[PDB]
Design a protein around this ligand. Structure first.
Ligand SMILES: Cc1cc2nc3c(=O)[nH]c(=O)nc-3n(C[C@H](O)[C@H](O)[C@H](O)COP(=O)(O)OP(=O)(O)OC[C@H]3O[C@@H](n4cnc5c(N)ncnc54)[C@H](O)[C@@H]3O)c2cc1C
Ligand SMILES: Cc1cc2nc3c(=O)[nH]c(=O)nc-3n(C[C@H](O)[C@H](O)[C@H](O)COP(=O)(O)OP(=O)(O)OC[C@H]3O[C@@H](n4cnc5c(N)ncnc54)[C@H](O)[C@@H]3O)c2cc1C
Lengths: 344, 344
């Protein structure tokens, strides 16, 4: 029987996988996406600066390193598989069941599902290459940059509609294209509908992202009606791609085992990655504890803690923490080649 | 007046410096060593694997990246300076005083002192280069590798004497060279003295670390008596350099402001980097909270949390957390050059 099943292949699940391997635990890693990376697959061309010890470079580049790390010890990896239920048969005996009916057994379970299912939108860029785009946004925090700008927002989820309203306060115009399979959320919509500089475009998708010359920005967007198929090209200064996150619609609402939940539908972490059920640990954006940050850095330190607690759960007399890698015997064979051949 | 004074230039203080800069805070960074890096300056040639997202490479290489990160926003850096006192004159008004009598003012204080003063021993290696040594150890956790080995340990601190005893259980012989300025600790010494395969060498230092041929290991060590100056060369299979850490002998025992302390002389973190005094935050190995790991990864996530809490302390209406770097406006000018010139 596998030592631990890890649900979620984002940076938190990946590091948890690595550190569980560092602690000599057999690992099963499950993720619904066709590739590992979680939310990081949303913003591949973006330059990341705030990961500890990592000089700024594209997210997809850092992701490649993070994935490699998660797979050093070669865990049992299951992609394109969606967990729907978690069960505790007994102590050191858990069942993890997918929507396809597959049932996986483990002595422990690590939940690293972030905010739920990630399904990145496939953007088709013409004229420019995506890796050099500047006016393409996947999240809105500061919106002062959008002053007097013609802004496009894709997605009609509550968060996207909130962004639209805030941006509308100073933007020249805001256009929201979406499909109404998006929530869309009555209150967020009611607020937005009286922003008279906002155009709502239901049943509409982004077909093409177009930029001229060489340029490093999108200058115009080809929009397409989902039903009629009619297209028209509109110029924008900024394009914002929302994804629609709802932490309240994960499996944790309808599994066969209910962890205590934070009021925002995050798993209640008891000081750390410990949950209300012994043997189950939550790491990353899904868990709440006082030391949390919404950062990849925090996802990593959570992963370590989840692996440690899972290790001591399976084997109580084991060390509380893992051996530091600098003096860990498992890396020595590789270290000599790395040093001798200067593989860094 | 400076926003925050950060005491300690290890990975935790460095990231805290970076993230404080990310949150648009003015920073003063103080460390007693002649160079930044903290404990990482102890094991520069060692290959590190367990930092999130970072492929294995020498510690000094990762340190260079970590230092660069800590200094992006160009804080006020004070090296070769030892803090001896911390004072809270009023809310958003702190005094940080060094042994030389210098007094620095800040609206907040971040304590990142690890286990206390770090003063790396200068090893002189002959025959081989340090970067390829394998049998050189700076910490002992697993000691099974020392079975039937002739082992040398430098340092007579309690921890080093504990290592010596454990190793003596399976080693062919253990030699402990030290100066008695080291504790040495009565009980640890009393335990060790009846290990009849252990040779105690007081008033003795390591002069030379010698390896033959090209080789990737130390084959023999030149020892020197501190008083007489007499030398003799002894062959060893492994060399262990202890440093002597005592968390109970930091400034936190005799400042003008007492944080609540964990029973192991670590600062009591209230769920995170929060201490018993508003405006003072502890990040890294110095602080205890339930989400802690003794890892660089945890030092980083602590640093972020300490910067955030310090930010909201100085400016209560500010956002709880900082803007993700991927969409942070402060990095955009640099991002275009990084992308255009492929500087990664
Ligand atoms: C646009 C954007 C920009 C960001 N920029 C930065 C930045 O610059 N620096 C930084 O530190 N952080 C940044 N972040 C945050 C960072 O991406 C997250 O903190 C991090 O991805 C969280 O890692 P995680 O593993 O905990 O969750 P996730 O990354 O969300 O991983 C969850 C994975 O588990 C999968 N999954 C979920 N549910 C189930 C199920 N029931 N069955 C199977 N599989 C499943 C999901 O599909 C997903 O792949 C950014 C976030 C976004 C959205
Ligand atoms: C030999 C060894 C191997 C390790 N290997 C790994 C590994 O492979 N992976 C990993 O993740 N971790 C590893 N670690 C642990 C890692 O080094 C620590 O977790 C990390 O350095 C802690 O960072 P810090 O900033 O909190 O403390 P520190 O690194 O100790 O930084 C403290 C700094 O503040 C300075 N300072 C202290 N006090 C005062 C004062 N009163 N005034 C002024 N200045 C001051 C100190 O001199 C020091 O420079 C290892 C530790 C050691 C000793």
């Amino acid at each position: 029987m596998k030592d631990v099943t890890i649900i979620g292949g984002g940076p938190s699940g990946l590091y948890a996988s690595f550190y569980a391997g560092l602690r000599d635990m057999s690992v099963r890693l499950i993720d619904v996406q066709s590739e590992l990376g979680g939310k990081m697959r949303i913003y591949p061309e973006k330059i990341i600066w705030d990961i500890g010890g990592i000089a700024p470079k594209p997210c997809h580049e850092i992701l490649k390193d993070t994935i490699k790390q998660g797979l050093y010890f070669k865990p049992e990896v299951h992609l394109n598989e969606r967990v729907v239920d978690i069960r505790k048969k007994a102590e050191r005996h858990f069942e993890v069941e997918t929507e396809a009916g597959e049932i996986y057994t483990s002595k422990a379970v690590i939940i690293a599902i972030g905010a739920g299912i990630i399904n990145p939108k496939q953007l088709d860029v013409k004229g420019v290459e995506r890796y050099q785009l500047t006016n393409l946004h996947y999240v809105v925090q500061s919106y002062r940059r959008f002053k007097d700008k013609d802004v496009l927002i894709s997605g009609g989820g509550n968060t996207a509609l909130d962004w639209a309203h805030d941006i509308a306060k100073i933007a020249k115009s805001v256009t929201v294209v979406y499909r109404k399979e998006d929530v869309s959320g009555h209150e967020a919509m009611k607020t937005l509908v009286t922003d008279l500089n906002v155009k709502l475009c239901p049943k509409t998708r982004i077909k093409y992202l177009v930029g001229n010359d060489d340029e490093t920005h999108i200058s115009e967007v080809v929009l397409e009606h989902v039903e009629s198929g009619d297209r028209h090209t509109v110029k924008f200064d900024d394009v914002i791609i929302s994804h629609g996150f709802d932490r309240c619609n994960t499996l944790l609402s309808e599994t066969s085992s209910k962890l205590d939940m934070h009021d925002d539908c995050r798993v209640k972490g008891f000081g750390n990655t410990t949950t209300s059920i012994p043997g189950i640990y939550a790491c990353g954006d899904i868990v709440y504890h006082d030391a949390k940050s919404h950062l990849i850095a925090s996802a990593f330190s959570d992963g370590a803690n989840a692996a440690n607690l899972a290790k001591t759960y399976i084997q109580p007399d084991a060390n509380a923490e893992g051996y530091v890698s600098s003096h860990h015997e498992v890396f020595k064979e590789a270290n000599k080649t790395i040093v001798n051949k200067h593989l860094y």
